[PDB]
DNA sequence: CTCTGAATCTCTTCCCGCGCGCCGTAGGAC
DNA sequence: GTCCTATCGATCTTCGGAAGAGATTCAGAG
């Protein structure tokens, strides 16, 4: 059902949608959407389970 | 079983971490732009944020 | 062709904005993407934004916003900041290249021990490039003479 | 092709007195 | 040191409110 609701296609599409909804007014870029995604939940500066 | 107790030695630690994060934010740039030769570690940091 | 682009910058830090861009261009070695970043100044009309000679690449779009004290450019849309104009550059390069003490007038001293005081002109020391303004000392309007650069009009 | 449904968004509301206590612009240039 | 100009003009403001109602967008179809 989520697949039926998904308007995105692939990893590039995933980064584009994530970047647009995360930062309205900010243009997506392949080198930059990673800089957003990794910092979201994988980068120590902004994620740490105690 | 889902709520845990933070005490002084943890909240103070978090605040100290915040201070150090601000200090790092400044001094990373200072070291990138600094000449790194005449600089001494006292020059790198200033106590005021912490 | 590197069309100029206008960038918002921390007022009072505008010099550090231009320098912090100047370092970052070479460090990111995008020297082939930037001309110079103009901060015109007279003896700085608008404590505010900067002009950068630049091209429009997404790497350069993020590069300028990766310099400290830089929100970004001023343009129609954030996706594409716009240059200024053909003639606007020339006009700015043109300007970047291109009050008498009346008797009875009330002024303040600009410097010295009497700076920022309520004084009244008493006479005219014109040809000496000087001034003479009454002051309130000892309870009197004593005659005190000052330099020309002590005016506060 | 846009008309009445819902569906999702923003804006607004939340008793009353008393009494302490403290805390209250910032950075850098001449 | 005093006296000046200015606001994260390279962040991330707090997720532990309900609710109640309008306003604003979107369906199934005439």
C1'-nearest nucleotide to the CA of C116: E3
Q: Could you give the CA distance from residue C22 to residue C27 in angstroms, rounded to a whole number? A: 9
Tokens of C117: 């005081």
Distances (CA, A) of A24 to A17, A18, A20, C69, C150: 10, 10, 5, 21, 53
Distance from CA(A26) to C1'(D13), angstroms, rounded: 36
Closest CA of chain C from A31, distance in Å: 9
- Method used experimentally: cryo-EM
CA quadruple A11, A15, A20, A25: dihedral positive or negative? negative
Decide if C78 contacts C65 (C-beta within 8 A). no
Distance from CA(C109) to C1'(D28), angstroms, rounded: 25
Decide if C60 contacts C30 (C-beta within 8 A). yes
Chain A partners within 8 Å of C78 (Cβ): 25-27
Closest CA of chain C from B29, distance in Å: 9
Q: Could you give the CA distance from residue C67 to residue C2 in angstroms, rounded to a whole number? A: 19
Q: Could you give the CA distance from residue B43 to residue A24 in angstroms, rounded to a whole number? A: 39
Decide if C67 contacts C20 (C-beta within 8 A). yes
Q: What is the resolution of this structure in A?
A: 3.3
Q: Could you give the CA distance from residue A39 to residue A46 in angstroms, rounded to a whole number? A: 6
Spatial strand order of the sheet with C140-147 comes to C106-107, C119-121, C130-137, C140-147
- Look at the block and give the residue holding tokens 């930059």: A32
């Amino acid at each position: 059902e989520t697949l039926r609701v998904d308007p995105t296609n692939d990893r590039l599409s995933a980064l584009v949608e994530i970047y647009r909804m995360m930062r309205p007014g900010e243009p997506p870029t392949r080198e930059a959407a990673e800089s957003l995604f990794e910092n979201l939940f994988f980068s120590e500066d902004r994620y740490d389970l105690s | 079983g889902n709520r845990r107790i933070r005490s002084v030695g943890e909240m103070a630690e978090n605040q100290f971490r915040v201070g150090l994060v601000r200090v790092e934010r400044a001094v990373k740039e200072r070291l990138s732009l600094g000449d790194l030769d005449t600089l001494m570690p006292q020059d790198m940091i200033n106590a005021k944020p912490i | 062709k590197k069309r100029w682009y206008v960038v918002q910058a921390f007022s009072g830090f505008e010099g550090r904005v231009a320098t912090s861009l100047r370092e970052h261009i070479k460090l990111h070695n995008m020297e082939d993407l930037f001309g110079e970043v103009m901060v015109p100044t007279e003896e700085k009309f608008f404590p505010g934004y900067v002009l950068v000679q630049m091209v429009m690449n997404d790497a350069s779009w993020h590069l300028v916003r990766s310099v400290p004290r830089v929100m970004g450019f001023i343009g129609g849309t954030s996706d594409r900041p716009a240059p200024i104009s053909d003639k606007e550059v020339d006009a700015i390069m043109n300007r970047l290249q291109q009050t008498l003490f009346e008797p009875g007038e009330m002024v303040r001293v600009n410097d010295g021990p009497f700076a920022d005081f309520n004084g009244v002109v008493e006479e005219v020391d014109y040809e000496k490039s000087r001034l003479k303004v009454s002051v309130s000392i000892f309870g009197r309007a004593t005659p005190v003479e000052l330099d020309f650069s002590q005016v506060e009009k």
